[PDB]
Every structure is written in structure tokens, then in C-alpha cells.
């Protein structure tokens, strides 16, 4: 009764050679949700936006994605509307008014019943975020969108889903998230427990420290997987509706000119914006897990590897590239996590990033490790 939730990349299909991944890669018997991303919403009508109609609609992306529950009738395929491209302003305009929100919910509504999706998935990035066109008042209105979209589910009678991905550090949840009235209306809380550090931040450290790190100080003493998800609890989230996201990538870094230290917390050249680009990618500051593993663990890789011991997240260097990331250790420590504090499952941002080519090795090999610890798992009552 955990789940394994994994979101899909509508873009992953461009990627070149072995990058390719497209609806037909997807390990449908590894997920119990899975996640088509994303649509968006449009500027002026406030309407869902589709945003690669020829891939979506006209090659029929989105009905070859939901039309594989006939042979994996068990699994739900949902959709997820926003993410990091969408920018947040379109959704802090579409939320400010009761018409405005009705206007969304309709859209949404049809939409769902057109290409035969299962539900939806709230990926505004992020309510009351300044940085990104939000302001103070959608945290109440964020509220009042979510309960409307679940008045509209239950009308529909069809038995949908509303879940949303959500980040856990405390000023965003105060910026945004009336945590017990949104847990109460959601199935399924996604917690974004990755990029906790990065290029922005301005040092080199691995992005999903499960635990704290002595040189974890001010705005990054809690910003670590445990202490985020034991935020969410204390905020007023029950147990059996958190699902812990799982990086299938890395957040690289160019150190800067000169530094031969490589320990985290290590002082980075920030205006490179990141590590080099990788060749499937082709993103500065981010490595897929399969762009890693073929460097770092290869017979004659010239990269080192480490661990932090306290994160319990690997990371690897060489010359002036450092990456932190996820590996098989360290996923199987936090799938043990998991279960000892009793959360609804895992989720993976994005399973396009597995080693789905079996480039270094076994096939699919960090989903098949979230499989192998949820299938076995029974989620206890809330704490
Ligand atoms: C959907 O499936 C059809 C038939 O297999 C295929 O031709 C098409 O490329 C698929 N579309 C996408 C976006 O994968
Ligand atoms: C890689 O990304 C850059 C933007 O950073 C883009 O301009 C360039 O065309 C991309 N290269 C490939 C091979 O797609």
C-alpha cells in the first residue's frame, strides 16, 4: 500500500542517441503513480496550457501514456501542471480570483477527461515565492484552489486524484502552504527533498543530504532530508500522506580557479553557473544519474569518488568538476528511512534519468531499488 511515484519528462524524448527516452522506455511495473510532465497554465485565460502540442496531442503522447494502463490496469497516470519552465507568476494570477480559479478548474476538468488521465499534480514553483511572481496572498488562495479542484474531482464522480510537489524548506511552507488544510485535501504529498543545494547557493555540496552536516548553519541547519520531512509532520501532515522524492540526478559545480579542496562546503566559481554541461542534458549545473555513473564508474575512470557520511549521499570530482548526487547506497539507505518513520512511498524526479539503457549495469537499477523496498512495505497508521 506504499507508493512508488514516478515522474515523467515529456522533453526526455529530444535527447540524442542513448538519451532518447520516450513513453515506450517507461518501466510501467515499477510505479505505482506515474506522472506525465507538464502542462501549464495560459497566461491570459488562465486554461490549461499544452505546452508541445505536436508531441503531446498530435503524436498522441498524452493518450499513449494513460492507454498503457490497459495492460497495467493497477497503475494510476496522472499529469502534473507547472514545474520549474511554467515560472510562477501565470499561477499566482490565475489563483488571485474566485473567477479566475473556476475558469482553471473547468479547463483542468476537461482536460482530464479528454486524454484520460487519472488525476492531477500541483507543481507551482512556488505560492508566495517573490522570486517568482508569487506574493503574500497566495497562500490563502493556493488553499481555495486545491479545495475547489477536489469539489470539481467529486463531482466528476470518476474517483481522481489531487496531489502536489511541495519543497520543505520552512520559508517556502511559510510563503505558501497551509500545511494541515492542504494534506487533508490531497492524496499524496510529493516532497521535493532534492536541489537543497546547489550552484545558487554558493558552495559545492551534495543536493540531498539526508541528515545534517556540521557545516550546515543558518537557512541550511534543517535543509536536509529528515529534518524537512519532520517538518512537514510538525507543520501538521500526517505520516501516511508523504511521499519522499528521490534525485535520479545530480547538481554539478565549477570550482573555482585554483582550489584544490574538494570537501564539501568547498568555495565554487559561482558565474560559471555550475558544472560543464553533460552530453545527453546539455544543462549546465545538472548530470542525469545515467551521465554519472557512465564517468565516475567506469574501469578506468579518472574521477574520485567520495561519501558524505553524515548525508549519506555520494559525490565525485575531477579537475575543477565536482557533483553530488544518488547512488544505489544511498537510495537503499534512504528507502530504509522510509520505512522506519512509516511515509507513504517514494518518488522519483524523473525516471527518464535511470540508468534505463543499462549503460553501467543492471537496467533501471535505482527504480528497481524503490520497488524492491515499497512492494515489500506496509505504510502504518498515522503517528
Ligand atoms: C504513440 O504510439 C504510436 C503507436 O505506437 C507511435 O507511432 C507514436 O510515436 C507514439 N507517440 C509518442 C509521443 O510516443
Ligand atoms: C545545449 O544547450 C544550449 C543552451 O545552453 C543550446 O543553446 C544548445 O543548442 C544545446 N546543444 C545541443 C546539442 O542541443
Not at 543558518?218 to 534525485?247: H, R
Not at 553530488?324 to 518513520?341: A, F, L, Q, T
Not at 534519468?353 to 506496509?378: P, R, V, W
Request: neutral net charge; glycine residues 10%.
Amino acid at each position: 500500500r506504499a507508493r512508488v511515484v514516478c515522474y515523467f519528462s515529456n522533453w526526455a524524448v529530444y535527447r540524442p542517441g542513448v538519451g532518447r527516452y520516450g513513453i515506450e522506455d517507461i518501466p510501467v511495473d515499477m510505479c505505482t503513480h506515474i506522472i506525465y510532465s507538464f502542462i501549464g497554465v495560459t497566461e491570459d485565460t488562465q486554461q490549461v496550457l499544452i505546452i508541445d502540442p505536436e508531441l503531446d496531442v498530435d503524436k498522441n503522447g498524452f493518450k499513449n501514456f494513460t492507454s498503457l494502463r490497459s495492460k497495467h490496469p493497477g497503475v494510476k497516470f496522472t499529469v502534473a501542471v507547472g514545474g520549474w519552465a511554467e515560472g510562477g507568476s501565470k499561477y499566482s494570477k490565475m489563483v488571485a480570483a474566485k473567477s479566475t480559479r473556476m475558469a482553471f478548474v473547468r479547463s483542468v476538468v476537461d482536460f482530464l477527461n479528454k486524454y484520460n488521465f487519472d488525476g492531477l499534480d500541483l507543481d507551482w514553483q512556488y505560492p508566495g515565492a517573490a522570486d517568482r511572481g508569487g506574493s503574500f496572498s497566495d497562500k490563502d488562495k493556493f488553499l481555495y484552489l486545491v479545495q475547489e479542484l477536489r469539489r470539481a474531482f467529486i463531482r466528476e464522480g470518476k474517483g481522481w486524484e489531487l496531489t502536489a510537489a511541495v519543497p520543505l524548506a520552512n520559508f517556502r511552507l511559510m510563503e505558501g502552504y497551509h500545511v494541515p488544510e492542504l494534506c487533508q485535501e490531497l492524496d499524496a504529498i510529493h516532497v521535493m527533498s532534492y536541489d537543497l543545494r546547489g550552484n545558487w547557493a554558493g558552495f559545492a555540496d551534495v543536493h540531498s543530504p539526508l541528515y545534517k552536516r556540521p557545516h550546515d548553519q543558518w537557512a541550511y541547519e534543517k535543509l536536509n532530508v529528515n529534518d524537512g520531512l519532520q517538518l512537514w509532520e510538525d507543520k501538521g501532515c500526517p505520516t501516511n500522506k508523504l511521499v519522499v522524492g528521490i534525485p535520479f540526478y545530480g547538481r554539478s559545480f565549477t570550482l573555482s580557479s585554483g582550489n584544490n579542496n574538494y570537501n564539501l562546503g568547498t568555495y565554487i566559481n559561482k558565474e560559471a553557473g555550475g558544472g560543464d554541461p553533460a552530453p545527453y542534458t546539455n544543462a549546465t549545473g545538472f548530470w542525469a544519474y545515467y551521465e554519472i555513473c557512465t564517468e565516475v564508474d567506469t574501469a578506468d575512470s579518472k574521477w574520485t569518488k567520495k561519501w558524505d557520511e553524515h548525508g549519506k549521499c555520494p559525490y565525485a570530482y575531477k579537475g575543477t568538476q565536482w557533483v553530488g548526487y544518488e547512488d544505489p547506497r544511498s537510495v537503499e539507505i534512504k528507502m530504509n528511512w522510509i520505512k522506519e518513520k512509516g511515509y507513504l512511498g517514494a518518488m522519483t524526479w524523473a525516471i527518464d534519468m535511470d540508468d534505463f539503457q543499462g549503460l553501467c549495469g543492471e537496467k533501471n537499477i535505482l527504480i528497481k531499488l524503490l520497488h524492491k523496498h515499497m512492494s515489500a512495505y506496509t505504510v502504518p497508521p498515522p503517528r
